[PDB]
Amino acid sequence: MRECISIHVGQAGVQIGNACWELYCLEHGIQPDGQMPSDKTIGGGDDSFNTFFSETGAGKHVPRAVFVDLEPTVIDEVRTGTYRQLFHPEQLITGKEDAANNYARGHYTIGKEIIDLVLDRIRKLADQCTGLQGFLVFHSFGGGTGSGFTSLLMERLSVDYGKKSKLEFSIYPAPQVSTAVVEPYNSILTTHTTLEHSDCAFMVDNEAIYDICRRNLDIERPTYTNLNRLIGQIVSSITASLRFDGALNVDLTEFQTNLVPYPRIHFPLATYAPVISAEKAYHEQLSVAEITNACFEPANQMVKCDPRHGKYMACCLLYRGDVVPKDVNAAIATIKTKRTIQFVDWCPTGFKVGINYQPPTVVPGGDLAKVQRAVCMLSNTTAIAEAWARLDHKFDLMYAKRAFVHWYVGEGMEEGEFSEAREDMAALEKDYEEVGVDS
Amino acid sequence: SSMIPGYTGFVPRAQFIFAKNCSQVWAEALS
Amino acid sequence: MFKNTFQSGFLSILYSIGSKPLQIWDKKVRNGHIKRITDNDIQSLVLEIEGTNVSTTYITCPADPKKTLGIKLPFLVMIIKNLKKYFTFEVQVLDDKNVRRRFRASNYQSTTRVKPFICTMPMRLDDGWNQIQFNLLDFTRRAYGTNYIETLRVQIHANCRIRRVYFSDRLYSEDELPAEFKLYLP
Amino acid sequence: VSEGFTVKAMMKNSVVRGPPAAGAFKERPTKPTAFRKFYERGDFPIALEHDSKGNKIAWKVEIEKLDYHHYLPLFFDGLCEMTFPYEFFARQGIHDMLEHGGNKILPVLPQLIIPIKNALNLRNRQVICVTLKVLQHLVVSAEMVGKALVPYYRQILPVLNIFKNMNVNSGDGIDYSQQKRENIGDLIQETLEAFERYGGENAFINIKYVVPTYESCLLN
Amino acid sequence: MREIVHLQAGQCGNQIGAKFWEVISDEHGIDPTGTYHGDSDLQLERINVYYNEATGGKYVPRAVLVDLEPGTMDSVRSGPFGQIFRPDNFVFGQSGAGNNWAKGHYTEGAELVDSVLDVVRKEAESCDCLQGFQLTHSLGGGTGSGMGTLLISKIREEYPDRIMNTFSVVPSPKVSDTVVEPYNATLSVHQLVENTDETYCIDNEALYDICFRTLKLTTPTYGDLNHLVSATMSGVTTCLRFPGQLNADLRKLAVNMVPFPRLHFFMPGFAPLTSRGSQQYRALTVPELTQQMFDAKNMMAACDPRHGRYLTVAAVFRGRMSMKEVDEQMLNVQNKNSSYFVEWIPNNVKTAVCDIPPRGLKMSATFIGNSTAIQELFKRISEQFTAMFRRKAFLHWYTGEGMDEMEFTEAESNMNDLVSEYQQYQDATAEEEGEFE
């Protein structure tokens, strides 16, 4: 009955989306062709699959996903690959002549031709829903489709749908390595039109997942397949309380309430523990206290910002597997006794705990090994005040000479919308230092 | 029939076959 | 700063005519410049702030980041020149509930947004020399519906010419102004 | 020390030498001009009148009936002179001919672009200030002169782009040399707004095409 | 889905594009007859980007061959892959230009461009959604440059909101085999700076240097020269015809590389090039590709990048490779060579990765650098133009055909303004202070 609609937008949305639905089929024992096997049963058949699937009376399951792109190079891999039969043909939405890494082209020129077609398919997926928990949006800040069309995808989802939850799974641009030159220009303008239309916004950047895949998983040369397998495990653990019964279950609206202190502050840091390979998975006894220390360790964060430089607001720990409520409350009390982890003085009950029963599921060909228990942490720190203080420098380092402005202006954007989005970020930097300062 | 409708790739001699759907014209083009 | 001092009528925190106009204002310049030149219309010295980037070049009061002004007077009045380039200014107040708020006035923004930490409103600058009269008491009772207690920081950003930023206890007309405060055009 | 893009640069402790400076801001040496060789030969009907009030060129013949096709390209060619007797005859002769011109200034404008550009290409600060004072005065000479410089924005403005950023940063020091008007970056903004106001409808998009950091002054 | 119409002007353009069409027919698996004989399904997935379907399972290129002498296209059609072109796509004059830009622009060129544009309209309106046009030519002759500039200036007027690539073999100093060459070059850059979306500068001198002291070729003929240009042309647009992990087509590359509308002259290079003797002994990975593509002897223009500052660099890799190495090596290059990159643009390098490697190679890389060292390539042509034009040599062969003396000086002035704006964007600081002292 609790139902969600995934909206994968852009090449980063689709390529992450192929990792998630390969994982979601294997958690529920669904074959790539759509139908559960008759000779075998993988797990007891329940209504647990109803959060992401809709069951045709003949016995087929169709995902509640809408794949959105402006070029056909990446969608036709879905239309030809192993999962060609799983998706309904009209869900896979494809435009022409992409966005050319241009926010103004993906907002004012190209996206206005496809906006009415996507919102009609969103209606026919949310009309079948007897009660909608909320949509999930997967996108990246760097490109044009994932930044421009996603900016006005939520502007029309907010007018049509009143207070339905719209979660974000963004890819923040890394501080040092980046595959673009106009990349600061896209992320300043994206956040300006997303601070108001998003109910939550988790961030992972590609540089920190590169470091974790090398020191923890012992992968010398990570690709984009190994990065998307880690992001799929985080989004599974968020929704694992929606589908499977647990001792302490947390709905989507429950940790949405219990992480944001103020409406502007919805930028959690997502960490996962443990991330260990198959040779070291079976020698280590991973207790509840062992896996909850790796979340607070500053090298294991998935955002390139150091939590020791700031103060925590609130946390949301999500344990799955063979865990008991005694070992959780003992392990949290150890964290509170240390003088290096620092919490704000107006939040004494800093933690929220969720416990599930079903352990994480390993995928064939993956890198992580199957473990009996795991934890996903969504912390909220004042250490995110330094991620934009670099990116406010990079935006101001080019905009004083007006580099690349002649491309965005010619597609319909005025000159002042670059500056009025810069003032909207300098108001946010002062917003955290007044929240984080003690009384 | 190894592709689904909406496929934007090129299929040989598919423009000549008419008044059939995507799967039928792809089958008649491959056969 | 001005907690101990008397506060009635006007309070002046800047003037373009003096030995050190910017004694208490902190000057942060980047891709910009600040100077003091004679005006072409009023035949008197004005301050200068220019720059291609609006955000980096500003002057803030007080100079110390920790210190606060603490001004009880309601209306803030500025005398600045329109140059038809981008210009902003901040005022930071203290409500009845002891929560610091903000009011940003951009001449390029068209949307008016309200939020508990900052409420940004547009502005239209008439050509030539003009006088800005701000209402801190009504804008706090309109955006948040709380009372007004004191005002802490005032920032003036790029692309303007500043002379005699001053507070008041109410809005006098041009007749009730003294000789020093009214702008004297030839 | 080492040069870039080598195996010697890709060491743990090596030092890399940067590129040499191009020379976009350095002063360029001058060349002999045609104004000097036509004044010494004796074609110009000019003479320097030492007055009590100042220095003013006295014209033997009337200024209205002069042949502006032959002299206006020649007097703009004296803008590259820095020695005393030629720099004063250049700029002061320019302003008087533009003052009493009337209807005939417009057809000479195709022939005036080349000495305008060569005056700004010396990268000498004193020449740039005087040339920019003429360019503000040139556009207000007649009615239809201003709309004719719009095709010629691509040749004058690339040097105005270089020196628009220079200005004094004395944070509270008073400028006591405002009368001389030597601030080039104050003059370039003053010059560019005069091009746009008299240029017409299509003046703004042409200036912003060449000078990137521009903001419209007529439009609100 | 996105179609590109190839256009080629002159003898140099015809030879270069004939080699290019042979190269990408080999890439897409097409016999000299024209039919498809391949062993993969990814070759035929996106073939409408360049080819046009015919009757009977045949594919003909979307190419238009404009020329002022029929012997060159006879040599083109009598080649190995010359029978796949439709015979309607050849458009020839009857009398040659004579290495005269005036003849190829005003006198003889105006009688052919209507017949050319009929074929261009016919071949470009029969597409699904056009990406842009492509042109290959050289700035030394009259047919390639004089007709080419007018052809671009008419195609841009007819289709403004399209992309336009050109590959200019600009003249070289020490190899120059034409007396009247700098006149044509100086009058051609004047049009290429205003009517073109992207221009790729290729030098015959640098082609000889690369083909000799890196490829180790005893006899580098023009076939071995045009192989390099064809490989670069394939590597630029392989992201548009083959699926990749991180893909970027022509519009994306133009948007991320061109900072200002007057600065679109690019330097190419290719990365895994090596001799036949040393091919078996050399292990090629991402560091080797990065080193060889950033090496200063590997530039396909006679311009040393150490003489200026890189404005914007792009690299298009081909093969199966990991993104961590691709990002790490070109972070290391920027970090080590800190002074040769502009300080008012951060992370100057754009990356793209395509999956399918070229024929016979397991990994390859293509370099496109927008550098500032093109100022010397412009000043050399400017001084060679001024030396000849000051005494007015060979001027009657242009001014008897309907031109003025003012246009030469106007072209020189425009190209000197171009030089000045590369100079200001070279010597520009992040903080506008420390320059005017």
Ligand SMILES: Nc1nc2c(ncn2[C@@H]2O[C@H](COP(=O)(O)OP(=O)(O)OP(=O)(O)O)[C@@H](O)[C@H]2O)c(=O)[nH]1
């Ligand atoms: N985390 C992660 N990021 C990716 C992946 N693939 C691409 N990206 C990011 O995506 C950003 C650019 O977006 P694109 O990949 O071009 O896709 P897009 O957002 O739709 O942009 P367009 O191609 O212009 O439509 C890059 O900066 C990458 O960081 C991936 O597999 N994982």
Ligand SMILES: Nc1nc2c(ncn2[C@@H]2O[C@H](COP(=O)(O)OP(=O)(O)O)[C@@H](O)[C@H]2O)c(=O)[nH]1
């Ligand atoms: N790179 C390269 N250059 C060539 C080739 N053929 C001719 N050239 C150069 O082009 C110049 C002559 O240009 P030309 O072919 O006459 O131009 P056209 O008048 O359009 O035919 C000569 O200096 C050659 O160096 C070729 O196949 N490859």
Ligand SMILES: [Mg+2]
């Ligand atoms: Mg893309």
